Tab-separated table of C-alpha atoms and ligand atoms in Angstrom:
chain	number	residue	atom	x	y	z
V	5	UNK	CA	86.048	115.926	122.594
V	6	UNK	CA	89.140	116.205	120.521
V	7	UNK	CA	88.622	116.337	116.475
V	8	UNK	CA	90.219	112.863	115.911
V	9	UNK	CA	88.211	111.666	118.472
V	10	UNK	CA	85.065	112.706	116.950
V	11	UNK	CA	85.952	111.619	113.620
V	12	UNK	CA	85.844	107.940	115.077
V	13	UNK	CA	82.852	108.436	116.842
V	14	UNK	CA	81.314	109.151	113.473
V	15	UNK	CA	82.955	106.774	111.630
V	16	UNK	CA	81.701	104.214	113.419
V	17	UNK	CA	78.499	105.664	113.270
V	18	UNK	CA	78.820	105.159	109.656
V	19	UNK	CA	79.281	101.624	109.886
V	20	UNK	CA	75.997	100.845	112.480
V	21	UNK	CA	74.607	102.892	109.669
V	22	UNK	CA	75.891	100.981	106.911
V	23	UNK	CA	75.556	96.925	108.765
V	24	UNK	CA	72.334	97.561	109.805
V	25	UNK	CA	71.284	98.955	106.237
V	26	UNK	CA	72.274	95.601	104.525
V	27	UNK	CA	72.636	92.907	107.096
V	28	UNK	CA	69.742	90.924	107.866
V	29	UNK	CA	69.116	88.209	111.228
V	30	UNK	CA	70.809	85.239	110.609
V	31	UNK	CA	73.114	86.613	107.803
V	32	UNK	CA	76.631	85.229	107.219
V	33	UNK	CA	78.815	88.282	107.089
V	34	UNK	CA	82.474	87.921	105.862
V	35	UNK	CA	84.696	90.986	107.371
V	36	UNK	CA	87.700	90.837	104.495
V	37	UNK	CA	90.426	93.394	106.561
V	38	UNK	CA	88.770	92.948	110.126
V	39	UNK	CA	91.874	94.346	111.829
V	40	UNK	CA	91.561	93.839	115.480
V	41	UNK	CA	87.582	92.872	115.299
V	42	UNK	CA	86.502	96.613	116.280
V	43	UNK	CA	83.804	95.870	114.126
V	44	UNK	CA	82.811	92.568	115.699
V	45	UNK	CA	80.378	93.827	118.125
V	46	UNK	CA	78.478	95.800	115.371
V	47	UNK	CA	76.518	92.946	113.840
V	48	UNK	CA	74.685	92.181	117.215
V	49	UNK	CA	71.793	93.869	116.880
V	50	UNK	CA	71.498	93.424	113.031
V	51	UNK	CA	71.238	89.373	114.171
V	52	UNK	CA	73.353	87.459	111.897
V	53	UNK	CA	74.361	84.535	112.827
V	54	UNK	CA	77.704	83.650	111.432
V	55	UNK	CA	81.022	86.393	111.591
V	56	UNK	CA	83.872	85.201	109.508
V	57	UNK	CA	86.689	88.038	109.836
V	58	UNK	CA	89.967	87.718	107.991
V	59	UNK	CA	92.898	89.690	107.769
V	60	UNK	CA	96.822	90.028	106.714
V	61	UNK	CA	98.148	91.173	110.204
V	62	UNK	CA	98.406	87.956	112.696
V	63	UNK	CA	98.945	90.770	115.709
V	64	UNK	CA	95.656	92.157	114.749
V	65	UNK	CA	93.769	88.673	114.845
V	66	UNK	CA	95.403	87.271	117.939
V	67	UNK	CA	94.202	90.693	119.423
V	68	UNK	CA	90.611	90.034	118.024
V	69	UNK	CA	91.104	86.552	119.360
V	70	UNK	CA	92.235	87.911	122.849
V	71	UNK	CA	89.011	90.496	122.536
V	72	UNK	CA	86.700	88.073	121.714
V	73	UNK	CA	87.840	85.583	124.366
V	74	UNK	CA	87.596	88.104	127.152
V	75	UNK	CA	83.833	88.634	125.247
V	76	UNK	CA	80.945	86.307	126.634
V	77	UNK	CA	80.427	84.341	123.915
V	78	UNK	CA	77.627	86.214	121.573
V	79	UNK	CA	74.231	84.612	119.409
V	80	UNK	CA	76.622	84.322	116.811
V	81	UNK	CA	79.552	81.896	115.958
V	82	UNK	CA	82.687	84.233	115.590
V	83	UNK	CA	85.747	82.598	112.917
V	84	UNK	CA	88.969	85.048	113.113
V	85	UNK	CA	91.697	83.784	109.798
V	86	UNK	CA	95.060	85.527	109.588
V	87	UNK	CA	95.265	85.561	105.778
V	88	UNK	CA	95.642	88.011	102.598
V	89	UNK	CA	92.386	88.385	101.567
V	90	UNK	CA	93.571	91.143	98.348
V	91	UNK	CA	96.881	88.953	96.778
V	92	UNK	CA	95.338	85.188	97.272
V	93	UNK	CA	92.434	83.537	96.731
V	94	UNK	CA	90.030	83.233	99.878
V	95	UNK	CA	90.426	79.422	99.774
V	96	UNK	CA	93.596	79.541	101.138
V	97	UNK	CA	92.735	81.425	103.864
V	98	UNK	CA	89.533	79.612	104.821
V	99	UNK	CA	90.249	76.460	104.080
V	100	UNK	CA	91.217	75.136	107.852
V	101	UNK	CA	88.340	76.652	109.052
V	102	UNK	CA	85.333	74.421	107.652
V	103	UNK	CA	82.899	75.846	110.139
V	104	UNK	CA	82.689	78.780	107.761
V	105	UNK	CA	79.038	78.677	106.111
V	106	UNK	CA	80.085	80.035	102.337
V	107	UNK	CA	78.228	81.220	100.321
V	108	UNK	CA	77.120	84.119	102.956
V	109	UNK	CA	75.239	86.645	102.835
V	110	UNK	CA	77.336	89.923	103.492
V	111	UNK	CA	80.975	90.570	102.302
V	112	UNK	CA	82.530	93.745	104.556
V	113	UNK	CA	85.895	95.702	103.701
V	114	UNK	CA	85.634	98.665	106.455
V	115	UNK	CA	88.568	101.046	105.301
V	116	UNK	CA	90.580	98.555	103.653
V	117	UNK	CA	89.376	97.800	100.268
V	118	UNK	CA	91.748	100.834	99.017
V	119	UNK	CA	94.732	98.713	99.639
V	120	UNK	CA	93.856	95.916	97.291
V	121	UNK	CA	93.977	98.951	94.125
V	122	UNK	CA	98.040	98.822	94.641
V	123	UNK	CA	97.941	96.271	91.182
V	124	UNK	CA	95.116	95.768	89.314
V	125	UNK	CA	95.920	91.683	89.586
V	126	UNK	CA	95.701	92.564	93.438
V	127	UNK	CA	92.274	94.943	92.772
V	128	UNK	CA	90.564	91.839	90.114
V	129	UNK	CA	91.531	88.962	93.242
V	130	UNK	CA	90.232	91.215	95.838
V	131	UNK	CA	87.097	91.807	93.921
V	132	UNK	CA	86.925	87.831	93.041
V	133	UNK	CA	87.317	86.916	95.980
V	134	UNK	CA	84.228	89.082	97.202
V	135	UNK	CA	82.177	87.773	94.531
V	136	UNK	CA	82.862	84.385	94.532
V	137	UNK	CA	82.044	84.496	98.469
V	138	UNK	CA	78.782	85.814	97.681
V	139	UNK	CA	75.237	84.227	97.488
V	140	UNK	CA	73.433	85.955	94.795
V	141	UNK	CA	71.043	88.651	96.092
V	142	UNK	CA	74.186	88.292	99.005
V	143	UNK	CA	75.441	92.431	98.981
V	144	UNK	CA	79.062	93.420	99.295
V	145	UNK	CA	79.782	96.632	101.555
V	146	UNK	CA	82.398	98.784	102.709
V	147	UNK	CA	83.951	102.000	103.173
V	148	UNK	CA	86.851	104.065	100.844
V	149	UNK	CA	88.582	107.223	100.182
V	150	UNK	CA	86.265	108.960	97.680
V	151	UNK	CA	87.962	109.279	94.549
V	152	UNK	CA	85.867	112.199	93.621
V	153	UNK	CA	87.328	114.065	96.404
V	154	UNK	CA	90.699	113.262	95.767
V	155	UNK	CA	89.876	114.162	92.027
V	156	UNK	CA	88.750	117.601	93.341
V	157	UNK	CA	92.105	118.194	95.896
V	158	UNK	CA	94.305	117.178	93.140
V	159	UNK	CA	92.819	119.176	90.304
V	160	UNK	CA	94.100	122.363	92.702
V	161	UNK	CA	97.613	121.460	92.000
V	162	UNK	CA	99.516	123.050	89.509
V	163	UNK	CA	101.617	120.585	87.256
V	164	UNK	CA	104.455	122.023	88.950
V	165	UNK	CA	103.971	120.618	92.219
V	166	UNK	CA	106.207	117.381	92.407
V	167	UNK	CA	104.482	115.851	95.197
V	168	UNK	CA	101.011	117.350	95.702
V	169	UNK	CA	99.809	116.834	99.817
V	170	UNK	CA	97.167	118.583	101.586
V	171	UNK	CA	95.489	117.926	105.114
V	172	UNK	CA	94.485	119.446	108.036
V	173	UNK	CA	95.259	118.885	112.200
V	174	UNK	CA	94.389	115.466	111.860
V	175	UNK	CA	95.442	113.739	108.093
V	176	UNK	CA	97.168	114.075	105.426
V	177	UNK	CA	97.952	112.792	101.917
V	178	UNK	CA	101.022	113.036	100.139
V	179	UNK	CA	101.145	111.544	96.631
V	180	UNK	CA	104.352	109.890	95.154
V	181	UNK	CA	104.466	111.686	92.122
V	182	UNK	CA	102.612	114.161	90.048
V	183	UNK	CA	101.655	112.399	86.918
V	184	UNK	CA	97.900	112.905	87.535
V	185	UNK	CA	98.678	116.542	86.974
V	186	UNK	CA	101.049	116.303	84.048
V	187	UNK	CA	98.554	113.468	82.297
V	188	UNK	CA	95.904	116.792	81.810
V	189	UNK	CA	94.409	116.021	85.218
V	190	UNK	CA	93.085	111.801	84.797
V	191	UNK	CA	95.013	109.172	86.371
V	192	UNK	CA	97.378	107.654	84.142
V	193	UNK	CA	96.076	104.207	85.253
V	194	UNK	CA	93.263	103.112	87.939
V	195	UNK	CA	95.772	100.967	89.671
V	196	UNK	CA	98.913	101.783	91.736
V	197	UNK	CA	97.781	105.536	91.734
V	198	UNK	CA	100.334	105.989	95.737
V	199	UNK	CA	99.625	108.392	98.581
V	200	UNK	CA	100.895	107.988	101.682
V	201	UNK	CA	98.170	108.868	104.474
V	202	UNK	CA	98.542	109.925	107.974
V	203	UNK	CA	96.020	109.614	110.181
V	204	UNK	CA	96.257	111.077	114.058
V	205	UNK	CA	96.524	107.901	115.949
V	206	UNK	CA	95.503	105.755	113.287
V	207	UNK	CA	97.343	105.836	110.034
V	208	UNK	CA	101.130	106.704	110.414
V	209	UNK	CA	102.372	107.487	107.431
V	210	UNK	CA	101.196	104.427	105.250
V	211	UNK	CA	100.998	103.955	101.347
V	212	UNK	CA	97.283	103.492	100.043
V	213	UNK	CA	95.761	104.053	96.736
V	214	UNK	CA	92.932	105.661	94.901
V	215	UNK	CA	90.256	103.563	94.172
V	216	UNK	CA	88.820	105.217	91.108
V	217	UNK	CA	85.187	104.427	91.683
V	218	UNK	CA	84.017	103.796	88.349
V	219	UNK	CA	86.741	101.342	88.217
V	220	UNK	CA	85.719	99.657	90.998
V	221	UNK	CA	82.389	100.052	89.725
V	222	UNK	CA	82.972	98.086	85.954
V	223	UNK	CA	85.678	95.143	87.939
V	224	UNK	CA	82.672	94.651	90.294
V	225	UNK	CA	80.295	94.975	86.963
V	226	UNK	CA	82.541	92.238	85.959
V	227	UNK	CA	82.483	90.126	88.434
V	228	UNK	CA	79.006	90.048	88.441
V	229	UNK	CA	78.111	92.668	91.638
V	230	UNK	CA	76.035	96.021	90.763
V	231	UNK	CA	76.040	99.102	92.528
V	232	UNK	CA	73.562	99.664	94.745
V	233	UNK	CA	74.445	102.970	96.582
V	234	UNK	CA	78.240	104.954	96.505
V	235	UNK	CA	77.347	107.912	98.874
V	236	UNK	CA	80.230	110.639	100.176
V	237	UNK	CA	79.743	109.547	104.085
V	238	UNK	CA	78.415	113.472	104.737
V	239	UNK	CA	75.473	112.524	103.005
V	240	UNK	CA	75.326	108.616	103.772
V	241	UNK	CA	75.247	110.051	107.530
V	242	UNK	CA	72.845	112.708	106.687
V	243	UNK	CA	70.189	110.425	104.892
V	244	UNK	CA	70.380	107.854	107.917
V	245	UNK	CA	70.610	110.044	110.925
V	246	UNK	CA	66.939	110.513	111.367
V	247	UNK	CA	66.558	106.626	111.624
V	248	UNK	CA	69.466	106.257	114.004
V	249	UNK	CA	68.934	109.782	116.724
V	250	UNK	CA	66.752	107.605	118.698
V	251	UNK	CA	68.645	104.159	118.701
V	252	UNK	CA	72.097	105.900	119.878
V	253	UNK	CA	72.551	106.352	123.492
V	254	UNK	CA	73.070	109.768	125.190
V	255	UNK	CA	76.707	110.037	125.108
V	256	UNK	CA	76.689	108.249	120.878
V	257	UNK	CA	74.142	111.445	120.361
V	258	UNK	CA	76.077	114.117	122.254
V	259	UNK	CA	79.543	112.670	120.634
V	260	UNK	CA	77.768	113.206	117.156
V	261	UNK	CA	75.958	116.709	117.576
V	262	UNK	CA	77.527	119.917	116.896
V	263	UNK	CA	76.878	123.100	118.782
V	264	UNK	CA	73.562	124.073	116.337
V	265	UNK	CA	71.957	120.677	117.039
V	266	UNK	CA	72.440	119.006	114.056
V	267	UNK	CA	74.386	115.718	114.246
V	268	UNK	CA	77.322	114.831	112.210
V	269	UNK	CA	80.937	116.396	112.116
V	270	UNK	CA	82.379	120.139	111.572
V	271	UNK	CA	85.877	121.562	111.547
V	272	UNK	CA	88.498	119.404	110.261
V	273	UNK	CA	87.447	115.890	111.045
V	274	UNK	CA	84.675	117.266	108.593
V	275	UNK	CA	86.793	117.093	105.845
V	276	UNK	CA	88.717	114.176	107.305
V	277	UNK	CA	85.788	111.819	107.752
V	278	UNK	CA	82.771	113.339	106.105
V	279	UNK	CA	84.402	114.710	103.094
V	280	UNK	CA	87.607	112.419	102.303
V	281	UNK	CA	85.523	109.038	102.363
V	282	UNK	CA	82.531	107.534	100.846
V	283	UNK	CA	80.780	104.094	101.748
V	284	UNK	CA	79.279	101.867	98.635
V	285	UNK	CA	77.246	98.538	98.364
V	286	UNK	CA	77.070	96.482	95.735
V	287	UNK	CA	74.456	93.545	95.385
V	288	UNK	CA	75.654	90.037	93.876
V	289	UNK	CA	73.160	89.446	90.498
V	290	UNK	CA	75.069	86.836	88.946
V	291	UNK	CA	77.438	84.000	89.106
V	292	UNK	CA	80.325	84.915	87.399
V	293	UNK	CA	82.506	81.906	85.698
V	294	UNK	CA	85.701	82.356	84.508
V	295	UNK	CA	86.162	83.035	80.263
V	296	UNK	CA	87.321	80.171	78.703
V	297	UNK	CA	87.188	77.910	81.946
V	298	UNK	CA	84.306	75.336	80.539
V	299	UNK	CA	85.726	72.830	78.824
V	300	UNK	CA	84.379	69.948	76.896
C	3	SAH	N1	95.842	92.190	101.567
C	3	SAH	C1	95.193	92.337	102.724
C	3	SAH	N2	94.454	91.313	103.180
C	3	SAH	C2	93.799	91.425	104.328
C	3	SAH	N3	93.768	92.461	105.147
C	3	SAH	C3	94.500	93.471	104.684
C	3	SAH	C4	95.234	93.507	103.507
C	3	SAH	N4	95.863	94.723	103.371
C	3	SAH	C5	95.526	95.392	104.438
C	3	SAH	N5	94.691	94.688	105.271
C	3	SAH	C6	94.136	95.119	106.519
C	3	SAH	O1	93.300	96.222	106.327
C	3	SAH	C7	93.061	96.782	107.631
C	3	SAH	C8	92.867	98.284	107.476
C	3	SAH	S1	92.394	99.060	109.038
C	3	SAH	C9	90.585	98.809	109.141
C	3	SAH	C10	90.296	97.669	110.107
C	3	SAH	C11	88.793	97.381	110.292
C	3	SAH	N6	88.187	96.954	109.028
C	3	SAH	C12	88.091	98.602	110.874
C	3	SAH	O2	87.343	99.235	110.098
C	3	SAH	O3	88.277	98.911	112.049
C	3	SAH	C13	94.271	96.399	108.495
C	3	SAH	O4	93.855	95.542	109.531
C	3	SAH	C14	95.177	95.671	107.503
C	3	SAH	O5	95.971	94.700	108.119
């Protein structure tokens, strides 16, 4: 009805899109940033049959616990950890919960990977972390601001701008500083690169950062994960929406299609959802071991 609310209706048709495209029956799916769970009830129908989700606010996993309680109990074996899954190694997290089957199949960050780019110590343990989680053939998913388009909104700026924000009726970005700008229009570093982003009646106000994607691209390279898609979601949603018209249910469709019958998003949650963000999946090729770790 309203714009924001149609910008989470697609969203989360993005991630049906994205789960179901990688996540196979029986898969072990870790969800690093699960927030409350909303994503919980996603991996159903894709089958898996083992959801470990993990993140940094306790109020958002008691709330996935209190969700999940009030939840019949699904075909698959639900873990929810209250632990900092970007600034400390996953062990810590997981360790007092054995029942976790690692290595699994499917590592998740839904809109949160962004947050581990604040250092790039933070961005290398994230990554890590992800990787050493991973089977190999085991894929690693998620969904980001697209540095592209923040590339292309910030290349509009003159160097005088101090603080260079744009947005529309339902976000906004404000950057901390200008240096992109004044360092002839590149980042001065991948890491630490500050906007704060609102969000109607999601985001108020907090700091994220860019996630330059070809430097999430070589730390993943590095860590032994290649890229197997990066797609703007516009045309993520546009190359799955034939598969998905007939699976979503009458009021999914008619909270997805706009007035000339195509289905997706228009007026400002277009550039809010469809434009601002992109989803990516890596696949996990290699076991990575640490340089100078082997020792005689
Ligand atoms: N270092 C960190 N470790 C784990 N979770 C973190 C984190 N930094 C931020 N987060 C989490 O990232 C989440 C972003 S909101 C997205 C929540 C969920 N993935 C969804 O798509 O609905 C928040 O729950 C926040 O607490």
């Amino acid at each position: 009805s309203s714009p924001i609310i149609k910008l989470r209706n697609f969203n989360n048709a993005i991630k049906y899109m994205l789960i179901d495209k990688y996540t196979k029956p029986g898969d072990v799916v870790l969800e690093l940033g699960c927030g409350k769970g909303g994503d919980l009830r996603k991996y159903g129908a894709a089958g898996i049959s083992q959801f470990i989700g993990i993140d940094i606010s306790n109020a958002s996993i008691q709330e996935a616990h209190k969700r999940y309680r009030s939840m019949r109990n699904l075909d698959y074996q639900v873990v929810l950890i209250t632990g900092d899954c970007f600034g400390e190694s996953l062990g810590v997290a997981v360790e007092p919960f054995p029942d976790c089957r690692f290595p699994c199949d499917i590592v998740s960050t839904q809109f949160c990977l962004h947050y581990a780019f604040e250092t790039e110590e933070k961005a290398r343990r994230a990554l890590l972390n992800v990787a050493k989680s991973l089977k190999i053939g085991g894929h690693f998913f998620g969904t980001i601001p697209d540095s592209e388009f923040i590339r292309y909104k910030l290349n509009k700026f003159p160097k005088e701008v101090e603080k260079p924000s744009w947005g529309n009726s339902i976000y906004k970005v404000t950057f901390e500083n200008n240096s992109y700008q004044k360092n002839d229009y590149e980042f001065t570093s991948p890491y630490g690169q500050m906007y704060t982003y609102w969000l109607e009646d999601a985001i108020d106000n907090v700091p994220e950062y860019v996630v330059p994607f070809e430097t999430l691209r070589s730390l993943a390279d590095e860590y032994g994960l290649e890229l197997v898609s990066q797609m703007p979601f516009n045309k993520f949603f546009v190359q799955e929406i034939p598969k998905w018209i007939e699976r979503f249910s009458p009021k999914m469709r008619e909270g997805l299609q706009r007035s000339d019958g195509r289905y997706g998003v228009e007026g400002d949650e277009k550039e809010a959802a469809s434009y601002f963000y992109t989803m990516f999946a890596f696949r996990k090729v290699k076991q990575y071991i640490e340089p100078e770790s082997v020792k005689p």
